[PDB]
Structure 1
Amino acid sequence: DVYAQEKQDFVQHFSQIVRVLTEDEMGHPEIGDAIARLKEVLEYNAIGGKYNRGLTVVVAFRELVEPRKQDADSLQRAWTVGWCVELLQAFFLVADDIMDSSLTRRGQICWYQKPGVGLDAINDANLLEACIYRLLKLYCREQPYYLNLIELFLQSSYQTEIGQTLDLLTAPQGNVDLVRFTEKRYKSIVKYKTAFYSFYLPIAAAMYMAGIDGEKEHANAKKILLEMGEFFQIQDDYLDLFGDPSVTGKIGTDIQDNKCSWLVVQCLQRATPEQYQILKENYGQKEAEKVARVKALYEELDLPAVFLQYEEDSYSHIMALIEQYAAPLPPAVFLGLARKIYK
């Protein structure tokens, strides 16, 4: 697989990323200790995930550029831009983990929860963000798409931040209000907080690196990619409860943490005034008894069948979007990604 194979070369390039990012320690030994801290931040937070967003950059680059044009340097730049996508995510996760008081991320203790880190992780998340632009300068400065990539990473940060704000306003900590847990609000939180950086950003970066800088081609790619992003998060919210941690590697937390999951949202539009009272009394409590009662109300309202029909209808629609908005890009850029997302 285009992904599975390239995932080794991708992860092997992290060693160079770290070396280059900690290189100013030579000329400026004054800041050596801060550079040593940066290295630990990169090593803890950029490593441990699946690297799929970063990998999407490398995979789309190979499918958008003529093999003849894909020289050693072009490839080193594609892996660097892939790692910039991974550093953007690492900065948002370090910060979000602090904001929602998380304990673990991918079964490892959150960086901020580590002894001696604490709220210093706020500066660490900022440093992870600064690393993107340092890498873009170091490798893509002389490239004609340099400014396009800077603006894309900056716009993606802003859209994710707007999304994060929307999420925090929708679900205040120590506040029970299912009235604001609407579908229209859910689609908006998903579009800004996840879809842009996870789906639009990787392909968009590959597109500019290929010289595809047209506004219409980017709007066309955006139409497909955000729709894929909307499906993905809906699948993430579903598998969190109605899935299995064997295949996924994540156990149900959405209920205990009062999250604006797609499940609680569809329960809202389809409920008798009595069924709405049951949800209000249970959702948000860390007692295993109350968590068990929520899962039951979803099952009765036939939400697994509501998701199953949503997935069938979603896949069909995304195939229709690819036919309509892929050209002139090779459909395989969108298809390779859709295959990995859908089941």
Structure 2
Amino acid sequence: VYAQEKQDFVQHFSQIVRVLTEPEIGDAIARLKEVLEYNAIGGKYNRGLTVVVAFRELVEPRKQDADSLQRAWTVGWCVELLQAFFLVADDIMDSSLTRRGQICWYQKPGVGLDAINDANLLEACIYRLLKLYCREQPYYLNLIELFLQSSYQTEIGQTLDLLTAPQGNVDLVRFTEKRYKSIVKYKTAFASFYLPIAAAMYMAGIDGEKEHANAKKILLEMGEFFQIQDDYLDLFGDPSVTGKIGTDIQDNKCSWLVVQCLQRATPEQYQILKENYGQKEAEKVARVKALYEELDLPAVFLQYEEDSYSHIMALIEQYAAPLPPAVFLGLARKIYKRRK
């Protein structure tokens, strides 16, 4: 049922590539196809599926014609492309090794830093699909501005993420709960959680500022939880399941884990963290992981996950109306107690 919905969405990718890859310029188009095939496939497709599922739940079935449904999974694929663009660039800036069970696109021999332009192409494909399928719709401009604003919000979050994580500089003093909340709100919460539901809302004709603000209250909080889970999985997740190798400790990141470590550490443990964090040495990384386990941070995360799920459920009860609670409940079911 949920895997059947996933299969139906993935089966539309062949048409997405086809319409995007329709002279000497043919070699560039062939490279775009390779870029699309490598970087837009292999994930969970939760964002793209959220557009499709929310649209169906928000639009009267007698208004869900063949062209309307096609626009909905096209916009779903635009959200996947936005995610693909940010991940290709993020893997370069985070010096990552693997993504979605395979070597990072930039790590491929013959790709390297050309992946910067490939990431820009993925971003360009969003607006090509919006023009091709939604140009005559009343929500066209609302969708363009939403994808543009979501990109700006993500980039500002990425800036905060990279600034708080300087290579070669100890930045323990900046690893506060307040800084953490700000980074994750902008780098992840806006584009991974608000964007898919707000896109389906605009397509359903729900353009009201108050309805978008109420949806935002639930979704930004859901996004914060999702990034916290991502930070936990960076170190304590199974790479065969997650499809990626963690780098947060080596990269001196303001991870949820380092924030929690600092709140619980003795002065002796603070020194261990200071001497071993944000460095390439495997033994220094192993020393930080041992400290996190000593401070029962996996147990602290399990308790956080329980408290956060109840909080998000309380926000759904307060702010879902007049939207069907299932719109938010479906997405919460998908991400809570997730190990991928």
Q: Is the 8 A contact 2:167 2:278 kept in 1?
A: no
What stretches of structure 2 of length at least 5 have no aligned partner?
A: none
* Deviation, structure 1 residue 305: 3.1
In the alignment, is the contact (CA less than 8 A) between 1:7 and 1:55 conserved in 2?
A: yes
Alpha-carbon displacement from aligned partner over 1:16-41 (angstroms, at most 9, x marks no partner): 1111111xxxxx93522221221111
TM-score for the superposition, normalised by structure 2: 0.94
The farther-off stretch of 222-231 and 104-113 is 104-113
Residues 282 and 291 in structure 1, CA contact (< 8 A), matched pair in contact too: yes
Query: What is the rounded CA distance, in whole Å, between the counterparts of 2:279 and 2:67 in structure 1?
Result: 53
Q: Give 1:308 deviation, angstroms.
A: 2.6
**Shift in Å at residue 307 of structure 1?**
2.0
Measure, in 2, the Cα distance between the counterparts of 1:121 and 1:294. Answer: 32
Whether the aligned pair in 2 keeps the contact of 1:282 and 1:294 (CA below 8 Å) is yes
Paired with 2:115 and 2:283, the residues of 1 have a C-alpha distance of 35
Aligned mates of 1:268, 1:209 — CA distance in 2: 44
Q: CA 1:335–1:299 in 2, change beyond 3 Å: closer, same or farther?
A: same
SS of aligned partner of 2:239: coil
Pairing of 1:220-235 with structure 2 (within 5 A): 220-235=214-229
Between the two proteins, the alignment pairs up a number of residues equal to: 337
- Distance in structure 2 (CA, Å) of the matches to 1:238 and 1:114: 27
Share of identical aligned residues, percent? Answer: 99
Q: Alpha-carbon deviations, 1:39-96, whole Å to 9, x = none?
A: 1111111112121111110011111111111111111101100000011111111111
Which sections of structure 1, spanning at least 5 residues, go unmatched? 23-27
Deviations 1:266-323 (A, max 9, x none): 1112223222111111223444433232222223333233223322221111111011
TM-score, with normalisation over the residues of structure 1?
0.93
Judge conservation of contact 1:3–1:59 (CA < 8 Å) in 2: no
Paired residue secondary structure (1:174) = coil
Q: What is the deviation of 1:249?
A: 4.3
Report SS of the residue matched to 2:241: coil
> Aligned partners of 1:18, 1:83: CA distance in 2, in Å?
10
Taking structure 1 as reference, are residues 249 and 36 closer, same or farther at Cα in structure 2, changes over 3 Å only?
closer
Mapped contact 1:3–1:55 kept (Cα < 8 A): no
Q: Which has the higher contact order (CA 8 A, sep 6+)?
A: 2
How far off its partner does 1:161 sit?
0.3
Q: Does the 8 Å contact 1:160/1:194 carry over to 2?
A: yes
Match of 1:25 in 2: none
Higher mean C-alpha displacement, 65-74 vs 292-301: 292-301
- Structure 2 CA distance, aligned partners of 1:119 and 1:249? 22
Give, in whole Å, the separation in 2 of the partners of 1:109 and 1:243. Answer: 18
User: Partner of 1:247: helix, strand, or coil?
Assistant: helix
Equivalents in 1 of 2:305, 2:219: separation in Å? 16
Q: Which moved more, 1:252-261 or 1:168-177?
A: 252-261
